[PDB]
Amino acid sequence: FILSHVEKGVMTLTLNRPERLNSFNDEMHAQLAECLKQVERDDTIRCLLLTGAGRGFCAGQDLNAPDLGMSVERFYNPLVRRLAKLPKPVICAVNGVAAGAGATLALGGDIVIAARSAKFVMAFSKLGLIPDCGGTWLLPRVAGRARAMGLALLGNQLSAEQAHEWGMIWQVVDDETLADTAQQLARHLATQPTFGLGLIKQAINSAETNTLDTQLDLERDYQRLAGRSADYREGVSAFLAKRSPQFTGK
Amino acid sequence: FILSHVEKGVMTLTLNRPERLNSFNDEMHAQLAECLKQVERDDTIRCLLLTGAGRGFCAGQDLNAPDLGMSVERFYNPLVRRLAKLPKPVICAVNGVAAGAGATLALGGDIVIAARSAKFVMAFSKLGLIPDCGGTWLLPRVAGRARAMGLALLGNQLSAEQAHEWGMIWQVVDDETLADTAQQLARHLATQPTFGLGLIKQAINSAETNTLDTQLDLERDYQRLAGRSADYREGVSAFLAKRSPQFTGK
Amino acid sequence: SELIVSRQQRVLLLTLNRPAARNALNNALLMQLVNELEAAATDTSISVCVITGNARFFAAGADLNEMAEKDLAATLNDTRPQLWARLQAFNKPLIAAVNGYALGAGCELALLCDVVVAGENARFGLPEITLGIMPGAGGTQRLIRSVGKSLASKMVLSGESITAQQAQQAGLVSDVFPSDLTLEYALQLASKMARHSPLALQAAKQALRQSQEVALQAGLAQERQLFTLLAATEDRHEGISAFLQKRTPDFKGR
Amino acid sequence: SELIVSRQQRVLLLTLNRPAARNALNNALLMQLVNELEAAATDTSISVCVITGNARFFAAGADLNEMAEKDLAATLNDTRPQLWARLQAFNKPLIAAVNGYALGAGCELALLCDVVVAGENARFGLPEITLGIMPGAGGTQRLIRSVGKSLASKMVLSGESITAQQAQQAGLVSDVFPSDLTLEYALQLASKMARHSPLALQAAKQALRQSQEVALQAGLAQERQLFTLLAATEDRHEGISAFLQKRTPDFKGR
Amino acid sequence: SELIVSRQQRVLLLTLNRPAARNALNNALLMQLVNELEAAATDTSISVCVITGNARFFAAGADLNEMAEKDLAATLNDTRPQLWARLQAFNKPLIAAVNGYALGAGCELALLCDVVVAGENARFGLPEITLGIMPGAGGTQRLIRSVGKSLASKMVLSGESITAQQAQQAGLVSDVFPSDLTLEYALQLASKMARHSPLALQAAKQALRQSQEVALQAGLAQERQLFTLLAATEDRHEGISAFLQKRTPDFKGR
Amino acid sequence: SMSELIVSRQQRVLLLTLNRPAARNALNNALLMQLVNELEAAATDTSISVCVITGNARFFAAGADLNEMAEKDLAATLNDTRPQLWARLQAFNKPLIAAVNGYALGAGCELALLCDVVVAGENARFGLPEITLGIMPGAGGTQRLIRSVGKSLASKMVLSGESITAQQAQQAGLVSDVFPSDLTLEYALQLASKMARHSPLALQAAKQALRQSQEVALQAGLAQERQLFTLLAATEDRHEGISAFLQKRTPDFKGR
């Protein structure tokens, strides 16, 4: 199912159907939704971290009326929306093969750190299907247009390193250090001005469809808000005092 | 003019004014429009392939009232729109120099494979002009913003390899294998779930101006449709049966 | 032939079916549309109607010949205007599911409807003006009320079309779906409505019609009296009971 | 409790305050809203009012019990409709600052206002139809006037909500701000208005009300006579003097 | 000086020309606009008019002095209101080609027109309220009819401007072109209209005017009678003949 | 085709006589529907120019069938057919004269109000006693009466239910002619014959202008009158009408 562990500001979720390569069934989507509810509502959890159990990250949807709209509409869409909605930094530690919904889900994390031997398999087209879970939204922005089209149309593997070189993910590390480095970053982010970070993430999300003019109003808006937070005050005094800042995330 | 050949699901069009470097005249635009009509309406043609005769791909518009709007409005705009509209994979095999309208046309293919010695010359600015044929739409998405601006403002050559490194095209091959590899891919795509591929292309096109929220509704929509195609059913049974799938493109 | 009639629960589907004529609104077609709606008005097993054409055409105007052989004298005594008045008089939720072209009469027929769901390739237009005529079925009244003077005037005075996307941003349409889904999504819209109390639908729709007929103050009073009407119905009880004790309501139409 | 009243210069703030009931419009709440506005109408120290709820709810309808224990006879003689008429009669700029849900009565209360500023997560809706009722406070008249027939009909006949973004594109709202700024930005809007001549505001607003009450020609004449009224005021002099000699005007309300 | 008059086939161009005064609507200017339109109304060689300003200003209000030296008594007997009524009475397609600022009277003059094409840098606004006045030339009636209550009220009560892009999304304008093309594109729009039957244009436009004057049902009947009028014209024959046998129609204006 | 409604003809004037003596000419559903079919059929018969509607000397129409409006409940009343028959009556596009003798009560008064012109018998009565039954006027009684006799008289009759004589009704402007009972119908027919002598289209045009006066404010009414007027300017009969008048003869109209 889904293993979850909270420690030191960091909520770490583990996709846990190891033999199936943590492919999703209906029961797994429900447990994930439940865990996310906690991340959203509990404000001591100031970083989420997704990762897979066993050797794979997520092979996506377990493929065993033909209305694929409903699956999208019930499971992946609210999951994707709320993750995008979450005013908290989300890290995807891709520890192995990420296929179908698993790849597009992984690629949609704010910061993605992939093991060296991990590969992203978006073979939707081979099944006469389309990349879901924001697939067709993400690829053009994460890889640029010519490559998103190439990846989605021909539909074949992308290694961690290729993805990296291509700008699609943030970092690639030796398999055996992945769990460590990801958890390193999450612990770090979980002590950073979470509110500020949440506005940054929202602003950047929003800028994809805003003009510069609209976006300058939104930045003024977010700065105005950020500069009233406790963490702004803390951050300008810690710096002035050459001491290390203690953020609460408000 | 324009040579055309249909074989094995693949319609291959050859820009054919070799000495002029397949630059366009009014008569050439008409023949191209006619050939495209066939691609759109004939649904056994499940891949289009553009390429040039002689040593060049396309030097663009042959420059021999000064109302440049009309040329754009008559020739290039409907050509660009309908290509974007085409729910079929289009491959541009750039076999030599691609200049002006020729470069921006080439760059607008879903999958672009360029010969090693090919160069993309967008020198519009040198003539006090702007990049047309979707030039100013494409460059920021295919190369990202700082590079689109740099390319369009200074207006000088871009080699196949540079373009590649930059993410603007899909592949670069030795000149003498170009015709072969392109035609290899087109034959391949012409046996793939064309309907699925057409939705993928549309989704990715649309995502450029959609929010994530809008785009998730459109993906649900396209999945719902894709999952009713013959090719979906065929693809999940071929895979389950460890046999090679026979797509019809519906 | 001409108009196909089909059914999905308390939803009635009306398909304009004249392919070779681009679904042009025949006198015969118009009359068949009128007969079907007037029959559904009193069929208590129906709650909502959907009107559609095909993928390429909703309706591409009206028969141009039937309109020519009418002279000053023949135009004064024409039957058609009352047909349109009877279509408008239909008392149940009327959804237009538009794919492809809705021009002239076709467009005026979509404006007649309560709600328009369009396909991504829909086009709306009033090209009457190019023929030396003008809209004679509500084009010059209904458009301007939902999109405002500048756009409606441009459309009516120049006769240029607009896309489904311009249409939604302007208020002429309230949905835009991929062409292959418009009809199916239109029907789902209809089935959601048809799940509500029939009398409520009728009183709500009457409230809505009357807003175009009166000043705001009178509109409010009239809404109050259609409101109060429902207070007196059995289904009002059922509707909120089924809602408070969390089930699906079964309405008697009383 | 129930309604908090607060003040910022000639701006009056009215906060619906029934959290546990999703700010549902109580009979008591409605009456308190009426008493406050009628008091502000004649307070010459007030120029503008802002109405808001909380982040999660503006107002999520009205008390469902208070509406059930009303039968045909009890619905005819209900007090509430006149309350709404008195709210509408408020003669000063009325801005609704909407966060979260504005549904049923809540939504009808935002439509009542002159200007709506919404938050990025606002939702507008009329779910009356799902309960076997319909809008009884202007929903069926005011919505359709600002967003047009297709959308208002869909909303009224199906009862599905729309987002703050759909709302602005449709004309139901004229601003969309981040949730944490809506109220603050609404108040700034109000303070800009409240900086203008009070009588001008009142005559301008009356001009605006009357546009919904009459045909255009009569609207123009009526605007002329409210115009001419101002010509006769002292502040007209002050307003343009302070403008021509570049200062901030001090209006006497005469 | 003051107003330049120019011609392109059956299209008449009227250029507000008071640069140093930001094209402010002079009493003299207004009267010249009235004289020109009333002359074109009866010139059978004209089908459409376009009004424009310059790149920086369409019209930045009206002369502020001419309005001050009017007191209660002088405001009652002012000549200007009838001038505006005569401008509105112009019976042919009237397109406003707006670049730069259209404020106060300038904006009210664009709202008067049937169709507005704006430039990318156009601004629309009613700052009357900041001067201790309000709109006295249709501002409080025409705006709210095309953009709805919230936006029109904000604009009228606060006096803040909007961009050409906000304007189009709101329905105040139906086109937005690069500044250097607005006028040229406006004229092409005009030439498309002017290619249609003149009487059809006039009857279609009258249909449109009347929609703002009556309830829908009466609007429909009135449209029917203007329709039937055209049925009786010679150009109706020409318009559809030229269309069916695929040529460009030559209309006699009968 | 209905024993209860005698259809008769005089030139271009059609006569419809309510004929349910036993039932005081009460408006049946069937009678109402018959009446609608007659006038609709007449609407398109180009040999007809005017209609006259009458009862007998004792009754024009004394209300409606009381049973038919009782067996209708809140639900049955919402979906009733009758209201659309009333709107179809009013949509009759040709001049319609009510010749009223004796009682025109309830639906009977409403019927007469529905007509363009009322000529009455000396002994005719007009009233809306719906309020006495615990209902109200259901076919225009509350709308058409006040428009022609003012708020005081209209509210009185509607709220109290009392009758008014033919003479009171002429003074109040509900009726525009009062004759001896034995002459009412005859004189009403002479009035239609005089109307029927004019251009069919002009009659239709002028009537339409009159109907719209009750539907739009004054300015819009004038604008509307002008487009109708202009309409006639395009007709052949307009030439015949003034030609036969200027050269002093009886005009022969072709309906165009």
UniProtKB/Swiss-Prot annotation, chains A, B:
The protein's enzyme class: isomerase
Keyword Lyase found: yes
Cellular compartments per GO CC: catalytic complex
Gene ablation phenotype (knockout): Mutants accumulate ring-1,2-dihydroxy-1,2-dihydrophenylacetyl lactone and are unable to use phenylacetate as a carbon source.
Up-regulation conditions: Activated by cAMP receptor protein (CRP), integration host factor (IHF) and by phenylacetyl-coenzyme A (PA-CoA) that prevents PaaX from binding its target sequences. Inhibited by PaaX.
Family annotation (Gene3D superfamilies): 2-enoyl-CoA Hydratase, Chain A, domain 1 (3.90.226.10), Lyase 2-enoyl-coa Hydratase, Chain A, domain 2 (1.10.12.10)
Task of the protein: Catalyzes the reversible conversion of the epoxide to 2-oxepin-2(3H)-ylideneacetyl-CoA (oxepin-CoA).
Short name of one Pfam family: ECH_1
Record pathway: Aromatic compound metabolism; phenylacetate degradation
PANTHER family for the chain: EG:BACN32G11.4 PROTEIN (PTHR43459:SF1), ENOYL-COA HYDRATASE (PTHR43459)
GO BP of this protein: fatty acid beta-oxidation; phenylacetate catabolic process
Protein name (record): 1,2-epoxyphenylacetyl-CoA isomerase
The protein's Enzyme Commission number: 5.3.3.18
Homology family: Belongs to the enoyl-CoA hydratase/isomerase family.
GO molecular function (one): identical protein binding
The species this protein was found in: Escherichia coli (strain K12)
NCBIfam families: PaaB1
Catalytic reaction list: 2-(1,2-epoxy-1,2-dihydrophenyl)acetyl-CoA = 2-oxepin-2(3H)-ylideneacetyl-CoA
Keywords noted in UniProt: Isomerase, Lyase
UniProtKB/Swiss-Prot annotation, chains C, D, E:
Highest taxon above the source species: Bacteria
Biological process annotations from GO: fatty acid beta-oxidation; phenylacetate catabolic process
Reaction equations catalysed: a (3S)-3-hydroxyacyl-CoA = a (2E)-enoyl-CoA + H2O; a 4-saturated-(3S)-3-hydroxyacyl-CoA = a (3E)-enoyl-CoA + H2O
Phenotype caused by lack of the gene: Mutants accumulate delta3-dehydroadipate and are unable to use phenylacetate as a carbon source.
EC identifiers of the protein: 4.2.1.17
UniProt GO cellular component terms: catalytic complex
Pathway(s): Aromatic compound metabolism; phenylacetate degradation
Enzyme class: lyase
Protein induction: Activated by cAMP receptor protein (CRP), integration host factor (IHF) and by phenylacetyl-coenzyme A (PA-CoA) that prevents PaaX from binding its target sequences. Inhibited by PaaX.
Keyword terms, alphabetized: Fatty acid metabolism, Lipid metabolism, Lyase
Record-linked InterPro entries: ClpP/crotonase-like_dom_sf (IPR029045), Enoyl-CoA_hyd/isom_CS (IPR018376), Enoyl-CoA_hydra/iso (IPR001753), Enoyl-CoA_hydra_C (IPR014748)
One Gene Ontology term of the molecular function aspect: identical protein binding
Record family assignment: Belongs to the enoyl-CoA hydratase/isomerase family.
Function: Catalyzes the reversible conversion of enzymatically produced 2,3-dehydroadipyl-CoA into 3-hydroxyadipyl-CoA.
Name of the protein this chain belongs to: 2,3-dehydroadipyl-CoA hydratase
Gene: paaF
